[PDB]
Amino acid sequence: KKLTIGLIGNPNSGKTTLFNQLTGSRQRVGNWAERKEGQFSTTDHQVTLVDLPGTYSLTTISSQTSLDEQIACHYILSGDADLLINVVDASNLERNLYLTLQLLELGIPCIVALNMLDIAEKQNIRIEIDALSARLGCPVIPLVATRGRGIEALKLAIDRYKANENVELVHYAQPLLNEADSLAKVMPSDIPLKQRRWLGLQMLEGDIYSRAYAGEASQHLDAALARLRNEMDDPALHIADARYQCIAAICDVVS
């Protein structure tokens, strides 16, 4: 059974190194129409690993997006990957989980690969693996460097992979969910309900680039925002703050 896996993480998360270790000399360097692609095997699977450009987020709310960011986003939303391996820097967890949260809100099958365990230890940081997994609703695999043990556990997890656990991640105010869902109902229904509801939130948060994916929902954004502004100060801020609360709450328990 062949699997297509996207490798995604922040810049300087050790992603290039992990890609190289996983694929060895079974790799091929193309471009996105630089696009690195490689092969490896697990017990059950022949995996095609696709290296996505380093990025801190699938989008940018307050400022201009980058090319790398748009490439990652488009690939992720295309649904070409059967699952993703989200490489996370254990020494800068809070910053790294911003991207992770987006992947999980999108409902994309995910395996977190906790990297840079050494540097975390030398920064006096210990991550509670099962605490994080429980809260994210996906596997969390410590990438132990010694004798490539982390790689072997990562391959094990790929063979074990099922859907993410359907867990509440962010706790949004009810008017936000309502408005996002009603926007979602009008978006191109070729997109899954979960992603259309996320796009909805992104629109409400001021994400300009999400409007490209939302089609006819953009015609209803103004009316949704006016309503929300009559029951809370600034809907975009309530979205960002809830997301900050979620990630901060996780980090306090987990780190």
Numbering used by the authors: 2 to 34, 39 to 260
Paper quotes:
Structural studies have also illustrated a large conformational change in the G5 loop of the intracellular Ras-type GTPase domain (NFeoB) of the prokaryotic iron transporter FeoB, when comparing crystal structures of apo and nucleotide bound states. The G5 motif is generally comprised of six amino acids with a relatively poor sequence conservation, although the motif invariably forms a loop with electrostatic or hydrophobic interactions with the guanine nucleotide base. We have used the EcNFeoB (Escherichia coli FeoB) protein as a model system because of its clearly resolved conformational change in the G5 loop as revealed by crystal structure analyses. We systematically mutated the residues in the loop to alanine and characterized their biochemical properties in order to determine their individual roles in nucleotide affinity, GTP hydrolysis and GDP release.
The kon values for the mutant proteins were variable but within the same order of magnitude, with the S150A mutant having the fastest association rate (26±1 μM−1 min−1) and the R154A mutant the slowest (4.3±0.1 μM−1 min−1). The R152A, G153A and R154A mutations did not alter the release rate significantly, while the S150A mutant has a release rate that is approximately 7-fold slower (koff=22.4±0.1 s−1) than that of the wild-type protein. Furthermore, the ITC experimental results showed that the S150A mutant protein had the greatest GDP affinity (Kd=2.0 μM), approximately five times that of wild-type EcNFeoB, which is also in agreement with a decelerated GDP release rate. The StNFeoB protein has, as most other GTPases, an alanine residue at this position. Comparing the structures of GDP bound wild-type StNFeoB and an A143S mutant protein (equivalent to EcNFeoB S150), illustrated that the mutation destabilizes the nucleotide base by altering the hydrogen-bonding network. It is thus likely that this is also the case for the wild-type EcNFeoB protein, while the S150A mutation generates a more stable nucleotide-binding environment. Our results show that the two most important residues for intrinsic affinity and release of GDP are the second (S150) and third (T151) residues of the G5 loop, which are also the two residues exhibiting the largest conformational shift in EcNFeoB (9 and 7 Å, respectively).
